[model samples]
Target: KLIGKEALFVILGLKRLKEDDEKLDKFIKTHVFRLLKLDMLAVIGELERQEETALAIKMFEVIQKQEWYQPDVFMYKDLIVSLAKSKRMDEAMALWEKMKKENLFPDSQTYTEVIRGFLRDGCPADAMNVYEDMLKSPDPPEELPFRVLLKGLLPHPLLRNKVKKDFEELFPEKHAYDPPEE
Candidate 1:
């Protein structure tokens, strides 16, 4: 019932708790009460949406304990993106490496998200690593991957020009394909 209506901003009115532990427990209880009938996965989503990265990491630990938990790429994606938003890209890449150990190559959509995250993390090489992997994916991706790379390579003129001549011909109508002066 209380998904976004969480007690994080809600202050206890009228009275303080008798003990500090009571105060802590009350806060915990409030949080627990707000989350009802949701599984660990759903709660993870909620935690992610709330940008509660630490709590989401804790809940991810809790998820691994659940018997039904499988090697899910999206779960890692959600966590990684959340970490990137908080500039914790190191932790995010650590988790990505863990995902790699699981042989969980991301789907095309998942690849794009991670590529953007890597870019935001100031690691274009890792983003290109992800792009190359996407190219090598078993299921051939369509236009999206190419377009994403075109945009991704924009700032790095040297890299952008590498594929520019080739794909620029593919979109001849939009043919203002020239190198950046910078």
Candidate 2:
């Protein structure tokens, strides 16, 4: 899991560099653009974790310009989470539109991430819209998408009760307490 190691190193290095100026300079000089794509994603994650929205946006801009940075659904999920956390929903939506325009079909995981982001940001209505869109798509969603949609809708009193009733009706055979069988 070198990718995991590299991500961890970036986080640890960022924290360490905050205290040691010399080490910080050395890290930047050595690691900057080395693993440009992954490192940029790591930097975005680090910045988001630190609530440095502005810096994250700038880094994302740099990433978008790179020819090698054709972000997949997971990367878009990360970006959406970061942008939504920063209250940049408009930018996030724009990015989603751009992704669609670029012919990148969002998978269930990506839809789940975006819906959760909207839900967490007090936009349950938008979350519901996303759910509707997913349902309307030609491909049938997997179980996880339904679960994530349920979770996203749970906090809203109006939608919560409605969704609960619907879930029971749709999946009456699968008891809430029943463990999934392989």
Candidate 3:
């Protein structure tokens, strides 16, 4: 049917629309508003794949206003994860806060990505805040993120010590290899 066809058109259209501000908003206001559910989703998936952050965020805003929209952590999770990897901390944290306001908690992977992002960005305070949020999650902490933070936090002994203790308590059966200092 035309469902797939229009999605491809929309995808191609977006490639053009994104580069032009006035036309982009015009298309979003006109054409994008008319997209069907399946077509809308196709565009979202395509935008994410293309790493079109501003477009993806705008699309999500559009999707959220749709009557069919529902709160889903994975929706926020994927967006935040990609934003984090792209070193887009403000948007990532904004999405994280938005997800929490909806009473949704991201899984271990989401927390890991955000924490790693903040740490890598030299924003240790932000990283610690995210780690605190992780501690409050109902889901059990995973060791992988702890390991990631631990390695990254090496220059900050106080922070590393705090995380190291938490990891030891959470996964006593597993060993955290100690790296000898120079």
Candidate 4:
């Protein structure tokens, strides 16, 4: 378990990881040994934001090898989304398949992330497949708190439209445009 100081240091590291400033190396040296799954994820997020696909995958691998890291559905979802955003669709889908083989149920958040990823990659059909798989799952999709999906869809209007159409087709009985309550 991380102590309060370690946690704070990790948080600081996360905040500094994205900027190409002089502090990046300092933050890396300070927190690299004490990093947790969340810290590694933060690094991945920064790498994705910078479009450093190879480095992001290396971070993912490091997290995967951690003895204490049991990446929940959300982490996998993020990984898939990040890979997709970087146009690494094959890697994203492979991670999704690995999640399935582990018997981990990808929740609605996961579905939305993967869908957004596929859409961003100009693979609306693949996004539809992810939505279909979500529908077929025994557990119903719960609305995720954040609009990661919408954020992912922001770059491609056409793909976003296709996503909406596919979602409507798959879940016709459900409301499509109900914004999450604040």
- TM-score for all models, in order of appearance: 0.65, 0.61, 0.83, 0.57
Cα lDDT computed for each candidate against the true fold? 0.65, 0.66, 0.80, 0.64
Better of 1 and 4 by lDDT: 1
Per-residue alpha-carbon lDDT of model 4 for 76-127, expressed as tens digits? 7776777888888888888888877777787666687688678768775567
**Cα RMSD to the true fold for all candidates:** 6.7, 6.4, 3.5, 7.5
Candidate 3: stretches off by over 4 Å: 1-3, 172-182
lDDT of 3 by residue, 1-182 (tens): 23488778877777887889999888888888888888888888777766787788888999999888898888787777667667788888888888889998778988887788788877787788888899999998877778778888889999988887777776666654542121
What TM-score does model 3 achieve against the real structure? 0.83
- Per-candidate clashes come to 0, 0, 0, 0
lDDT of 2 by residue, 1-182 (tens): 23456656665665656556688657755654454576667777777767666555555666777779776766666777778888787777767766666666677777877888877887777777666666656665555655665666655657766655655655566536531211
TM-score head-to-head 2 vs 4, winner: 2
What is the Cα-based TM-score of model 4?
0.57
Total backbone collisions, model 3 = 0
* Candidate that scores best on TM-score: 3
Model 1 accuracy (lDDT, Cα): 0.65
In candidate 1, which residue ranges exceed 4 Å CA deviation? 1-38, 162-182
Residue lDDT tens for model 1, 54-153: 6677667756665566888888999988887777777887888788778786887888788777877777777777766776677755456556666777
